């Protein structure tokens, strides 16, 4: 049972005015926000001073396939896309 989106936890994040400041991203407590830099899907827990972020899925290019990626936009528009013709 594969896992596509990997999640990580950033600890000891700064909490100001009830919001998490994570790499210049302001996320109010108990809210799920899609970020551009990093291109992750983050959720703040200010009581524990932590941020749970979901990453884009890793890509293994198949035959006749390629990767289309752009840094613009927020998650998941900035994720790399495993594009195969269809």
């Amino acid at each position: 049972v594969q896992e596509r989106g990997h999640t990580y936890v950033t600890k000891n994040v700064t909490v100001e005015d009830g919001a998490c400041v994570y790499l210049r991203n302001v996320i109010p407590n108990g809210e799920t926000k899609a970020l551009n830099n990093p291109c992750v899907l983050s959720t703040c827990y200010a009581a524990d001073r932590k941020v749970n972020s979901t990453l884009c899925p890793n890509i293994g290019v198949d035959e006749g396939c390629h990767v289309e990626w752009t840094p613009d936009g927020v998650y998941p528009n900035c994720c790399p896309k495993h594009v195969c013709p269809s």
């Binding site: 950033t10 990093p38 291109c39 890793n58 390629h66 990767v67 840094p71």
Partner: protein, 112 residues
């Protein structure tokens, strides 16, 4: 053949972790005569070490070397606090035993 008929080499894959940017890995498979060979499965394993000395193992990824350039491609997305990415690529050719598969290991470093 001696040890393995295949040789693995990275192409267009600098061993440097850039923040906020996905990490691409392109592996070429050659033979003893320096000739590209396509249709060879390549399995990638990876391990990340962050600023707090914590270790994370990624799920293995699979690709196949193309018939036009003998390249297998992977794209990894790493957490924000990662300092070291130790990965390894190994062939999985159906005509070779396990012991005779080409294996190579690399270590990508974040700025310091």
């Amino acid at each position: 053949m001696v040890l393995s008929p295949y040789k693995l080499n990275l192409v267009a894959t600098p061993l440097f972790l850039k923040p906020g940017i996905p990490y691409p890995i392109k592996v070429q498979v050659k033979d003893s005569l320096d000739q590209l060979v396509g249709g060879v499965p390549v399995t990638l394993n990876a391990q990340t070490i962050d600023v707090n000395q914590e270790t994370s193992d990624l799920d293995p990824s699979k690709s196949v070397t193309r018939v036009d350039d003998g390249v297998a491609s992977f794209v990894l997305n790493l957490p924000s606090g990662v300092t070291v990415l130790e990965f390894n690529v190994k062939t999985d050719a159906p005509d070779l035993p396990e012991e005779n598969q080409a294996r190579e290991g690399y270590r990508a470093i974040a700025y310091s």
